[PDB]
Amino acid sequence: SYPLEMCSHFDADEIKRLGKRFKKLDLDNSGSLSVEEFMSLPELQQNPLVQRVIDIFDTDGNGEVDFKEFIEGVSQFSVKGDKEQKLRFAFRIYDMDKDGYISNGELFQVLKMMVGNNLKDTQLQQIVDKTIINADKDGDGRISFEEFCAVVGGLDIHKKMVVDV
Amino acid sequence: LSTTDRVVKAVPFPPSHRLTAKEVFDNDGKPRVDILKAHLMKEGRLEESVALRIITEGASILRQEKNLLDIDAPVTVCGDIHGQFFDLMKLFEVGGSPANTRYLFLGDYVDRGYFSIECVLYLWALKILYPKTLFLLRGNHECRHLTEYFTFKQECKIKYSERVYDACMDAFDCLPLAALMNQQFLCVHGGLSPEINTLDDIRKLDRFKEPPAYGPMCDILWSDPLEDFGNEKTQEHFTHNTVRGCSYFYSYPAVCEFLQHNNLLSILRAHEAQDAGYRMYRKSQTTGFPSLITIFSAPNYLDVYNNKAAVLKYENNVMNIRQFNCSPHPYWLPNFMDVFTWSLPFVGEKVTEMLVNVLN
Amino acid sequence: DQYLAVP
Ligand SMILES: [Ca+2]
Ligand SMILES: [Ca+2]
Ligand SMILES: [Ca+2]
Ligand SMILES: [Ca+2]
Ligand SMILES: [Fe+3]
Ligand SMILES: [Zn+2]
């Protein structure tokens, strides 16, 4: 069987441990993780960003996460990853269409997921509008990665985006 | 669902256009307050130079005025606004059009509310248009320390620049400290002072500066009546104000003596929030008229108090109080916090939390 | 504490 080609921060034994954890999550042994298999864990059932993470990991866009995508996904949360790639993963959470920019509609929808009934739609739309206006420097009505980091790059949240493998 | 276009399109989008000097001022140098009012309600902004011109020209008018204004009836007296611009709009509907109504504001135009710079820009513009019929007094929030401690300095940096903030600070120094209304009422923001026994004591003050930590100028802006005002026991006149951490508490015998010595009927002030928007204190045992009146013009204070606001319309020897409720205003997160700063710690938390559990 | 709360 031909070898698998990946790009991650993990050692051989770390890819192995992640491998045995991948097989355990693959209930039907289909070789890939599904949304249902992700939601099988009770701790993920009340998490409003599970679908966003899955969509990000799913780099081929088939709706499921294979072993390669699994490794390359988790790798962005390694201790051996820099501040940039962790802020970029955060950027990708808002950037739904993956075009490299954050638009008004995108920022709203992702916020709506996280807020729920804690705010009104009209209220949420207003603060989404004013946020982009103040952070948009080149003035193209959308937020780039540089404009994004210019706003949050001092909150040190990349510190609390680290998992143990 | 579209990822680019706005989802809730019914919600009005704040205009990017910034009003020019030509659009705000006419050929005669008069500010178009109607144009200004409508634009500000859309959360629209002006050019910096235009905003600076409204502030400075208004300041030049204010600094030509005395510490103690002489204002005759009829007049509408107003209390705290605290940056509640969209409630200020309702205030002018209820209190009457400044085109044919005399006005007296008792201060606290900024802080707490997230439309403080719009309140100043509009009021200053009205002052330019009606220099002899609209009047503004200084509140304890119209200074450098409180505006930096709260949100007004922050608001200027977000909506405009620190230059505009500096201009406002210099303009606030020019604000008169008190007003003598209809030869009967002393009108201040806070109240009385142990170092102010006559009206001329106010005239001798140097108001063109930062309010000191203590003294007559501090007390006018900061002092409160006692909690048991009218029902004193240990009496005294002035005691240390533990609520403010500065200035004094003044008593009923204290104000009554001041009224009798200066031949005044009552004292109009603000400084303290009221559920009814106003409060009538104990009548004087000489006139049978309330010796102290508190006016509060900020309805639903901090969007939480759910209080009514009020204005005092004194005309035809009748002191009528117009109560009014709050009005809708565009939403702001606490301290002008943007959604990225708000949501990112939640993103980093939940996303990390998910992965910890799928690897447990 | 499931959804993002207004501070
Ligand atoms: Ca499977
Ligand atoms: Ca896949
Ligand atoms: Ca995008
Ligand atoms: Ca941009
Ligand atoms: Fe106040
Ligand atoms: Zn005050």
Domains in chain B: how many in total? Answer: 1
To the question of whether residue A78 is assigned a binding role by annotation, the answer is no
d(CA A62, CA A72): 16
Catalytic residue among B17, B39, B141, B240: B141
Strands (E), chain B: 18-19, 45-46, 68-71, 75-78, 103-105, 134-136, 178-181, 185-187, 224-225, 238-240, 248-250, 266-269, 278-280, 292-295, 309-315, 318-324
DSSP string, B148-175: HHSSHHHHHHHHS-HHHHHHHHHHHHTS
Contact C7 B337 (CB under 8 A): yes
CB contact under 8 A, B333 and C4: no
Q: Do B8 and A52 touch (CB under 8 A)?
A: no
**Which residues of chain C lie closer than 8 angstroms to B336, CB-CB?**
none
Classify strands B292-295 and B278-280 as parallel, antiparallel or unpaired. antiparallel
Query: Touching check for A27 and chain B: CB below 8 Å?
Result: no
Contact partners, residue B204, CB within 8 Å, separation at least 6: none
d(CA B14, CA A104): 13
Give the three-class secondary structure for B315. Answer: strand
Record the resolution, in angstroms. 2.6
- Nearest by CB to residue B339, choosing from A105, A128, A158, is A128
Instruction: Return the structure tokens found at B357.
Output: 């559990």
CATH code, domain carrying A34: 1.10.238.10
Ligand 5 centroid, distance to B204 Cα (angstroms): 26
Q: Residue B161 contacts by C-beta under 8 Å, 6 or more apart in sequence?
A: B48
Give the CA distances from residue B343 to residues A20, A107, B21, B339, B347, in Å, rounded to whole numbers and listed in that order: 34, 10, 39, 6, 6
* Range 299-338 of B in CB contact (< 8 A) with A: 330-333, 338
CA atoms within 13 A on the CB side of B113: 27
Spatial distance between the Cα atoms of B300 and B322, rounded to a whole number of angstroms: 16
| Chain B residues inside the 8 Å CB shell of A16 | none
Binding residue positions of B for Zn(2+): 108, 140, 189, 271
| Separation of alpha carbons A10 and B58, rounded Å | 66
The backbone region for A31, taken as left when phi is positive above 0, alpha when psi lies in -120 to 50, beta otherwise, is: left
Angle ∠(B33,B186,B190) on CA atoms, nearest 5: 80
**Closest residue on chain C to B343 (Cα):** C4
Chain C residues in contact with B304 (beta carbon < 8 A) = none
Q: Which of A88, A127, A147, A164 to mutate to test the interface with B (most CBs of B within 10 A)?
A: A127
Q: Do A46 and C2 touch (CB under 8 A)?
A: yes
Give Cα B185 to chain centroid, integer Å.
Answer: 20
- What's the domain count of chain A? 1
**What are the phi and psi torsion angles at B189 (to 5°)?**
-90, -50
CA distance from start to end of chain C:
13
**Spatial distance between the Cα atoms of B40 and B88, rounded to a whole number of angstroms:** 12
Q: Which residue of C has its CA nearest to B349?
A: C4
Which tokens belong to B86? 């969209």
Report the chain A residue with the minimal C-alpha distance to residue C2. Answer: A46
Q: Which residues surround ligand 5, an ion (CB under 5 A)?
A: B 80, 108
Residue A28 identity: D
List CB contacts of B121: < 8 A, sequence separation 6 or more. Answer: B36, B40, B46, B51, B54, B55
Label the pairing between strands B309-315 and B318-324.
Answer: antiparallel
Q: What residues of B form the annotated binding site for Fe cation?
A: 80, 82, 108
Using CA atoms, how far apart are residues A17 and A10, in angstroms rounded to an integer? 10
Whether the link from the prior residue into B299 is cis, omega within 30° of 0, is: no
Q: Quick one: which of B87, B67, B289, B298 has its CA closest to B185?
A: B289
Solving technique for this entry? Answer: X-ray
Residues in B closer than 8 angstroms to A155, CB to CB, are: 341, 344-345
How many other C-beta atoms can be found within 10 angstroms of the C-beta atom of residue A146? Answer: 10
Helices B85-95 and B33-41, packing angle to 10 deg:
140
Q: Left, alpha or beta for B182 (phi > 0: left; psi -120 to 50: alpha)? A: left
Residue A139's SS3 state is: coil
Q: What is the torsion angle, in degrees rounded to the nearest 10, for the CA atoms of residue A9, residue A11, residue A14 and residue A15?
A: 80
Residue B289 near residue B283, CB atoms below 8 Å: yes
Residue B202 is part of a domain; what is its CATH number? 3.60.21.10
- Residue A54 belongs to domain spanning: 1-165
B145 is catalytic: no
In order of B36, B134, B304, the CA distances from B112 in angstroms are 23, 24, 12
Q: Which chain A positions have a beta carbon within 8 Å of B10's beta carbon?
A: 122
Q: Which of B3, B158, B340 sits opposite A97 (nearest CB)?
A: B3
Query: What CA–CA distances, in Å, run from B141 to A68, B129, B210?
Result: 60, 24, 11
Residue A33 CA to ligand 4 centre (angstroms): 36
CB-based contact, C7 to chain B, within 8 Å: yes
- Per the listing, tokens 């993920």 go with A44
CA distance, residue C3 to nearest chain B CA (Å) = 9
Ligand 6 (ion): residues with CB under 5 Å are B 108, 140, 271
Q: Which of A127, A132, A120 is nearest to B334 (CA)?
A: A127
Token pair listed for B321: 């109080």
